[PDB]
Design a protein around this ligand. Structure first.
Ligand SMILES: O=C([O-])C(=O)[O-]
Ligand SMILES: O=C([O-])C(=O)[O-]
Ligand SMILES: O=C([O-])C(=O)[O-]
Ligand SMILES: O=C([O-])C(=O)[O-]
Ligand SMILES: [Zn+2]
Ligand SMILES: [Zn+2]
Ligand SMILES: [Zn+2]
Ligand SMILES: [Zn+2]
Lengths: 268, 268, 268, 268
């Protein structure tokens, strides 16, 4: 017609997690064969971005707060939106092994459903905002699964002192996630303590807004990462802890990744 | 926490349409009691915008192609996203009474589920893009239900000559929607022929991009509407038949409507 | 725990149909690796049942009206639930090519998403109820894609005389689906006229309740099929045009198909 | 047509929980105005059943494992399916206040969306299976909101000794839900300790299968309830910890409740 136009496929999966012992939800956007560049048709090695949500969000957050499905509609990229509830992408002290579920089970589930997604590091990426920025860097440092990793307004440094002081949720919550604050192993949850064992083959990007409550956290964390020689680029701009800025950062991410992003025309 | 933030409620309804004789889907976004201005808490007369999709879309289109759920999250507005398949919001010649289903049944269904939505014209609005711009103006002209109506890149004028010539879909399709092209009643589907009987108490807005295939259609249609004294404001800018521009127009619409839109802060 | 138990994966897909020129929905239930018999783990040739809905239904009908997701949870079977609106799995006279979309596009879409589903006739099955029984037999007769095909209370014979006489919907509806009733090609829609060209390598099953308004239709249709030597088994019982009986027939179907159905224990 | 038939409306709601500080999902089935008995049309006091899931389930469990949407389609009943993750409908020791969210917030959310649901005890009911049987009895004992409450294979008695011994999940899990096992307040989670303060105006029903791992638990719990004079009827049959039996018990529940259940005809 001229009236007709493509769309990515939108897939919502509910599956049984053996790790968590419960039904879990994951959303997947999958490229539109009729709209990607000609060369990409039939691909058996499609690149994949895992995009992680913030505290209070879920598998719908990115899709509803950005117009990601519109942005990517001409691009050869699978995007996976997992859920972690309020568990920080962490195996918690109350027995929910969210990190194991994210890092070990989810990729196996997806591969089993979707053999044509890439299994290559050079085509596997992660990013997230807020709690999801912590999750993205944690997963990339520990797993060496990703070529590129990004944090937007991430909680990239913390301590008991900062978590609680009880402006950021109460003690029982934080100790449920990370263990008791007197446990000498608490520090294993600190991203700075995970750099040494990572392989140094992941590119990192971090952003934070000047006005964000986590701006000081990011300044401190990046300084510590840079001291250890992490391959990181850090940027800042005016902004707060809000989804408009996360949308902007998604659009920066899409150009940074090696995905041949087909940016929509904008005449106004 | 400072980490926590609200969200609108997102409601997906599947219901039995007696008019269409089938299960139908409608999405509704409903304002977050914890985030709207104080005065709006407990409202029993909440304003409502019906937002109509384009050819090939459905009840998910606006939500996935704009970040409407983010934009409206501090605003006291219900938004309803109906579906019409490829039926043009029209009672078709193949027996699917989509116009009756939209104009008569859907509002009764919604009121029955949601008694706290407004029943007032001064708080009831419609808009749509492409086919949905035709639908929005048709519904507003015929029903007098709305105070404000908006069309974005709408198919606001047409004839056999323009539909088909077969660049815009084939004959059987168009005649299925509007009837045989030799029927002397074809012209009842033309928006210009619906102005006389409307009550003149609806404000109209139309937009079209210069580069759009429907730019000439809109120029012609608005000239005809203005000749009949319709209360319409018409604007144009650079743009094509694409969702980025429809997102921009949604943001213009939200300020135009009498809804006390709480626009998100944008520091960059 | 003993408290934990598996579930099939439930997948909801929205995809762009090039054939129909619109976003379409298809549901897929996919076997639980942790619950199927040991031997089936890792299968790259998983059997597939397409299950078609009735007039007024959609891709959710089977899942919500039967407890299919519970019944199949130990069985190595993919089940696909397509949607055809009110189009009878037919390329209609108003330009919606539902048959092409079902028979050609949908299998290619699914294979592209899900390479581990079978591509073998011996592991590919179809069934449906009411309109979906017509669709199941039509698709199996025309395509030779299936080893087994089943109709439950199907509209397996019809004419203008029976459609309309206007007890079963009005003329414009029926002629929109099948063309004008005076067209000499109307009879190409009759299943009896499709037997000659089918390959005779599909097993057919049909059921109808004695009290159903289509009981006479089924008696006539099966007699005509049996006259042509179709490989069909036909059964009847007390019942009407209702989902309880369709649930019962699903359970009969699951034993008939060569799928090694792992029937749940029922101690009461 | 005779081909057309009604359906209940199926509503999926995602809403912001202030209590939990996260987006939460609740499903609602709402009666079909065209199919309920004549007298019920226009009701502003529609009865409501809350139906709670088991460990590992969610808001979709009842709908997918029973054909509840089919069973209730002629009946004037709203059914609400909440989610509690693995939190036992309890304000947990890791800071997720699931009980407050269920008992205080959810009813206010639903009333705000759906003013025509009843606010009367005589028309408000709860039931659940496994963990959800514990939840149903807990909520009914504490709140006095319900006239009728039902448990199917519920975990109605427990201790450290039985939880763990580590056949039923590990220590960290159970202590995350209920607190440390040495806390003298552990016993506040025991349903037997909640009877004294309840008002004695709720009717209780419990079922358990003989072969279920919780059969001894139910025998013990009911004996303790009967010693305290609770108004309870307890039944047992052959069965295990499986959804087929929960489906059977749902069908018993529907006749027990004062809802004028319109049971589907079953001629076979
Ligand atoms: O966004 C813009 O300014 C553009 O690219 O036209
Ligand atoms: O969008 C902008 O330029 C703004 O408002 O900062
Ligand atoms: O359904 C039955 O009767 C059984 O198998 O126990
Ligand atoms: O289920 C049955 O046996 C019946 O009621 O026909
Ligand atoms: Zn830089
Ligand atoms: Zn103007
Ligand atoms: Zn037989
Ligand atoms: Zn009894």
């Amino acid at each position: 017609n001229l009236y007709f136009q493509g769309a990515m496929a939108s897939i919502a999966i509910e599956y049984h997690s053996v790790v968590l012992g419960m039904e879990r939800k994951v959303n997947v956007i999958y490229p539109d064969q009729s709209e990607i560049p000609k060369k990409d048709q039939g691909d058996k090695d499609i690149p994949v971005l895992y995009l992680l949500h913030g505290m209070g969000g879920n598998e719908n957050s990115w899709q509803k707060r950005t117009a990601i499905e519109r942005l990517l509609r001409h691009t050869n990229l699978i995007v996976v939106m997992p859920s972690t509830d309020l568990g920080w992408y962490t195996d918690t002290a109350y027995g929910l092994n969210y990190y194991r579920a994210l890092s070990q089970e989810l990729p196996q589930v997806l591969a089993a459903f979707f053999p044509n997604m890439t299994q290559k590091r050079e085509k596997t990426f992660v990013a997230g905002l807020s709690m999801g920025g912590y999750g993205a860097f944690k997963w990339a440092l520990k797993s060496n699964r990703f070529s590129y990793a990004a944090s937007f307004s991430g909680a990239l440094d913390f301590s008991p002192e900062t978590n609680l002081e009880g402006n950021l949720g109460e003690l029982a919550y934080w100790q449920g996630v990370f263990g008791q604050f007197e446990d000498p192993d608490l520090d294993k949850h600190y991203l700075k303590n995970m750099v040494a064992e990572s392989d140094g083959k992941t590119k990192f990007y971090a952003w934070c807004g000047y006005e964000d409550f986590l701006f000081a956290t990011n300044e401190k964390a990046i300084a510590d990462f840079q001291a250890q020689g992490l391959d990181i680029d850090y940027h800042k701009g005016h902004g707060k802890h809000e989804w408009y800025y996360w949308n902007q950062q998604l659009e920066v991410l899409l150009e940074w990744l090696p995905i041949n992003y087909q940016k929509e025309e904008r005449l106004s």
